[PDB]
Ligand binder design. Structure first.
Ligand SMILES: *Cc1cc2c(nc3c(=O)[nH]c(=O)nc-3n2C[C@H](O)[C@H](O)[C@H](O)COP(=O)(O)OP(=O)(O)OC[C@H]2O[C@@H](n3cnc4c(N)ncnc43)[C@H](O)[C@@H]2O)c(*)c1C
Length: 468
């Protein structure tokens, strides 16, 4: 590699091909989708990120930044062999300021973000539950978690960013400075260079936040009206509730979080309990860091910073951003789950999240206000199929997950639905993926791309192509 000798001569730290250091940074989270970079740069400073980008641009090699490496389709590698991969997980600084603003390096994992903001000032951001997820990939495409309906997606509290452009030039952007770049980073942020700092307006970390679960005993006769009643409750429910429906061969269960105490949560859910019949709510009030710890899972490191991070799964996933569904659409879905899902040997599961409703912060911005387009949808579905670490993923798994999703999406009006770039689907056609993830924002994203990455060095198979 001329690109490797360029990096060494620019005093950019790199991993030697085939070494233990290469295996540490260069093993994709998803064991189904390993990739072999041309080079792995391991910068500790913004100056080293600039030099690494300049080296890639000079040699015409595709460049991919990897923060936490949780991409379901290994897009931090580029979703193919041969990129210059810029490993960012050595840069995990979280700095909270007295005015409640925070400057965070994207290589900080969500558990480290939550731990540092909690300990520095009892502050928080609206991010998802896995603690190992990088804040870079998460916030640049959305970031949905247990307080989304009150505080928005992670990117809804972003107020600034620092980006290494594909020239190596370091720029600042905000609503008031390079606002076109700042728009694109807030939902399509892999496309425009390496983000090396994100600035946010934190919120006060709740002293009292209640997690809750509702165990259900549904079948093909009760599940359609139960899912419809769940959805209808979600449309009107207060911003303090974020919740989801989990579904697998084991049946149906509600889980969520409520900003407030247990008594208030039980009063707020009583109409949904009355819709269902014969259910009990389980609920526990904790503080914010208690809530983060609870959803991390038993025995998971809630504050991961080590370069030796090595979480893995072996899986295929897909998603659906959907408007409100009819009860007939829920019947089609439950029919698929009760027949094809029930008889499947696969360990599949899905979540149906309420992202919208009258009071939701996620559905407050218009679709065009950020690159994140799915502001008009009520539901976010995640579909997941996993096999053991030492199994090969079977191709009938693609058809199982496609069938689960299409049991809903094949009945929806064209242009009213899509997919979530944080839950990317490897099997979709390349340009159909760009429309699923960014919808009506694609045209403006292509113009931003033509301005900031005209040579399309920051590319992957599902990424935005430059068009002025
Ligand atoms: C593994 C995992 C993923 C989860 C989990 N829980 C989630 C949740 O509760 N809510 C969510 O909204 N999402 C959840 N996800 C999915 C993650 O949000 C996505 O998997 C994120 O994309 C992961 O981010 P990260 O770990 O940083 O992944 P990478 O593979 O490094 O990058 C993803 C993507 O973004 C680009 N990129 C990263 N960093 C940068 C920077 N600094 N600049 C530019 N571009 C960047 C990559 O190139 C790639 O395209 C729970 C679990 C267990």
């Amino acid at each position: 590699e001329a690109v490797n000798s360029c990096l060494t001569q620019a005093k950019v730290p790199t991993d030697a091909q085939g070494s233990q250091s290469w295996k540490e940074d260069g093993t994709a989270y998803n064991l189904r989708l390993p990739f072999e970079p041309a080079a792995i740069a391991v910068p500790t400073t913004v100056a080293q990120v600039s030099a690494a980008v300049e080296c890639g641009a000079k040699h015409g090699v595709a460049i991919s930044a990897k923060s936490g490496g949780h991409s379901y389709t290994s897009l931090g590698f580029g979703g193919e062999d041969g990129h210059l991969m810029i490993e960012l997980d050595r840069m995990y600084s979280v700095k909270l300021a007295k005015d409640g603003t925070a400057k965070i390096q994207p290589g900080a994992r969500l558990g480290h973000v939550a731990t540092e903001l909690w300990n520095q000032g009892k502050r928080a951001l609206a991010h998802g539950t896995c603690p190992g997820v990088g804040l870079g990939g998460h916030a640049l495409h959305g970031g949905y978690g247990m307080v989304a309906r009150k505080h928005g997606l992670t990117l809804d509290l972003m107020i600034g960013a620092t980006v290494v452009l594909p020239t190596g030039k370091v720029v600042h952007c905000s609503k008031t400075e390079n606002s076109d770049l700042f728009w694109g980073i807030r939902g399509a942020g892999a496309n425009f260079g390496v983000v090396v700092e994100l600035e946010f307006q934190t919120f006060a970390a709740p002293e009292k936040i209640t997690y809750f679960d509702i165990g259900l005993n549904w079948d093909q006769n009760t599940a359609p009206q139960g899912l419809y009643d769940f959805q209808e409750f979600g449309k009107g429910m207060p911003a303090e509730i974020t919740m989801q429906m989990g579904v697998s061969k084991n049946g149906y269960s509600v889980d969520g979080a409520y900003i407030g105490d247990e008594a208030s949560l039980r009063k707020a859910l009583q109409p949904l309990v009355q819709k269902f019949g014969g259910v009990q709510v389980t609920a526990t009030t904790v503080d914010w860091m208690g809530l983060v710890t609870h959803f991390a899972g038993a025995g998971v490191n809630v504050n991961p910073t080590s370069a030796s991070y090595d979480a893995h799964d072996n899986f295929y996933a897909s998603s659906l951003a959907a408007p409100a569904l009819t009860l007939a659409e829920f019947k089609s879905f439950v029919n698929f789950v009760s027949t094809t899902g029930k008889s499947s040997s696969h360990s599949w599961w899905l979540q149906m999240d309420i992202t919208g409703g009258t009071y939701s912060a996620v559905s407050k911005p218009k679709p065009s206000d950020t690159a994140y387009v799915h502001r008009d949808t009520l539901l976010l579905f995640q579909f997941y199929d996993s096999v053991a670490a030492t199994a090969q993923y079977p191709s009938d798994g693609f058809n199982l997950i496609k069938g689960l999703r299409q049991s809903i999406s094949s009945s929806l009006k064209a242009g009213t639905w899509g997919m979530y770039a944080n839950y990317p689907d490897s099997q979709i056609k390349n340009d159909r993926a760009t429309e699923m993830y960014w919808g009506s924002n694609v045209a403006k994203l292509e113009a931003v791309k033509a301005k900031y990455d005209p040579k399309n060095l920051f590319r992957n198979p599902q990424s935005i192509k430059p068009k002025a």
